[PDB]
Amino acid sequence: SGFRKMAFPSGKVEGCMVQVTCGTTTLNGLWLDDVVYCPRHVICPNYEDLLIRKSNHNFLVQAGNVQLRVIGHSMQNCVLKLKVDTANPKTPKYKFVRIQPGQTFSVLACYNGSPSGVYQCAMRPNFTIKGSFLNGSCGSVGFNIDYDCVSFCYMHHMELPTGVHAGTDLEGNFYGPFVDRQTAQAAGTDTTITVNVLAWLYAAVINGDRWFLNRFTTTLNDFNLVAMKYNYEPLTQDHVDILGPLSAQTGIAVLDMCASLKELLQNGMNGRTILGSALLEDEFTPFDVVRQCSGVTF
Amino acid sequence: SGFRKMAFPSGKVEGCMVQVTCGTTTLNGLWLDDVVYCPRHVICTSEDMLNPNYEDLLIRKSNHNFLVQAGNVQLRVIGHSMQNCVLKLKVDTANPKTPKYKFVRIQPGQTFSVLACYNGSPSGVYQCAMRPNFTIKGSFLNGSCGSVGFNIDYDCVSFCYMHHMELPTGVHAGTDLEGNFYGPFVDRQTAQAAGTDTTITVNVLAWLYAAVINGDRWFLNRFTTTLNDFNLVAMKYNYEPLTQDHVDILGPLSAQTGIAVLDMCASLKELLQNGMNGRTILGSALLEDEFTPFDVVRQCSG
Ligand SMILES: Cc1ccc2cncc(NC(=O)Cc3cccc(Cl)c3)c2c1
Ligand SMILES: [Cl-]
């Protein structure tokens, strides 16, 4: 029993964190095989022009107490790829994956190439992450673990004025309409990840929290009409299908749980909590719920 | 033990019934807080009924045209507005007997209790199900318009139906409490017919599980079925398709009795083919479809 916001074990990723210094700027890099990936803003904008003025020895890369020697440099979108002489012996089996909003991932927050903490995030529908970052966290990565393979899905680049965070996939493509420069940028109006709230309601049912259940059901269209009024993401037939296993395990049809959510949105919790929360939690995907309520290991 | 068609206690709803009179028309209204909800056709003169322009008829009305009576007390109407096919009469007194309530729109197959009223006075309570053709097989006479359908799960009354009309087959049509009709019906005297009705398959299976919980297994068999083969057979007996949602909903009953849903489906398939052969199931010689899976669990267990 119990339901916690749980991150993947960070060990395979910790062995990849290095410190990248370029001039006065110090941030984090991800050392995989003989390449160090880091935000291109470490050179700071005309990034092609700033990069052409740099030499390999301008980038000081530090892996623990060992200084790596940079033998090449190239830019792929908003990520800098520093070719190093040494292949990381701790390189795990990995993939670079781009995630969709609503998907969750773990973030290994680092400062000076050293991991300080790990937390679980969700890519918000407005493509920002409500992370926890201080100055020096740039280059901290977001990942998932698929059996023994680390899927890198995020690299931290910046903080928006609202305290939320923006970054890219590992191919340097930003999540959201953000750019890596000092200019007026704002996170768009956020919405609630509906499929995730339903997944979390199923987790609450599995943990014995059933007060919110009711005898009612709803049409998918009637629910989307209601959900649109509360700034909730539309629930698609894909989401309903994804929720299938949880629906089968608890005996509560997806549209049945949707009617519980409809009443919760119009009536609130009425002094009650669900999984120790007085708010509807949207940062657990249907897969996160199944994995935590089954015990999958890495 | 025992399985009865059980209605919710009507007390919380009785304290909300008021009489609404507009001209020659008298029907029932539901007094919740300082609002009286009733069918908008109370403003019609029966000569309007065929093609009524409700916006046009309502604009010609004043607050003092609507006489609202709560017991022996005449309530004062201080405002009026129309929301779909329901009239909302703002009154100068909040109902002190207003219970904790919600307005819920139900899906076909769902059940609810009906508090039948005449002249703002409750005369009886019965259990009903929203038919797959969106009609209800109620028991209503003239003057029952405005009688409400509800469920009382826990201490909150969930209003799901307001009676508006009787179709030519003796079945009834009405709306949710936001004035949206169930089915393709309109509050007009025009030619309207209930579509071909079908048996609520998930409810019959729930009722077969209730029979098993009550000690009856005569109808069970050694067979199982695929969901698709059950639906092919069920369609031929005018039964609603059973979806994966229904199979999932039947999960708890299947777990409690040790009989898999598709196993129980094979038993229903056999009953459809053979009939009962002079036998009964829960005192009925017909397959009962007005108990949902939720009704069976509430009544048989708690
Ligand atoms: C005579 C009678 C008998 C039983 C009845 C049972 N329920 C309702 C009655 N009346 C109506 O249906 C009034 C009506 C007519 C046309 C359109 C609308 Cl929206 C309403 C009943 C009347
Ligand atoms: Cl329903």
From Swiss-Prot, chain B:
Q: What is this protein called?
A: 3C-like proteinase nsp5
Domain Peptidase C30 stretches:
1-302
Which portion of the entire protein is included?
3264 to 3565 of 7096
> Organism classification, top ranks?
Viruses, Riboviria, Orthornavirae, Pisuviricota, Pisoniviricetes
Organism (species): Severe acute respiratory syndrome coronavirus 2
Kindly list the places in or outside the cell where this protein is found, as annotated in its UniProt entry: Host cytoplasm; Host Golgi apparatus; Host nucleus
Q: Where is this cross-link: Glycyl lysine isopeptide (Lys-Gly) (interchain with G-Cter in ubiquitin)?
A: K5, K90
Protein function:
Cleaves the C-terminus of replicase polyprotein at 11 sites. Recognizes substrates containing the core sequence [ILMVF]-Q-|-[SGACN]. Cleaves and inactivates human TRMT1, preventing tRNA guanine(26)-dimethylation of tRNAs. May cleave human NLRP1 in lung epithelial cells, thereby activating the NLRP1 inflammasome pathway. May cleave human GSDMD, triggering alternative GSDME-mediated epithelial cell death upon activation of the NLRP1 inflammasome, which may enhance the release interleukins 1B, 6, 16 and 18. Also able to bind an ADP-ribose-1''-phosphate (ADRP).
What is reported on the regulation of this protein's activity? Inhibited by pyridone-containing alpha-ketoamides compounds 13a and 13b. In turn, alpha-ketoamide 13b (tert-butyl (1-((S)-1-(((S)-4-(benzylamino)-3,4-dioxo-1-((S)-2-oxopyrrolidin-3-yl)butan-2-yl)amino)-3-cyclopropyl-1-oxopropan-2-yl)-2-oxo-1,2-dihydropyridin-3-yl)carbamate) inhibits SARS-CoV-2 replication in human lung cells. Inhibited ex vivo by michael acceptor inhibitor N3. Inhibited ex vivo by compound 11a and 11b.
Regions of this protein lying in the Cytoplasmic compartment:
1-302
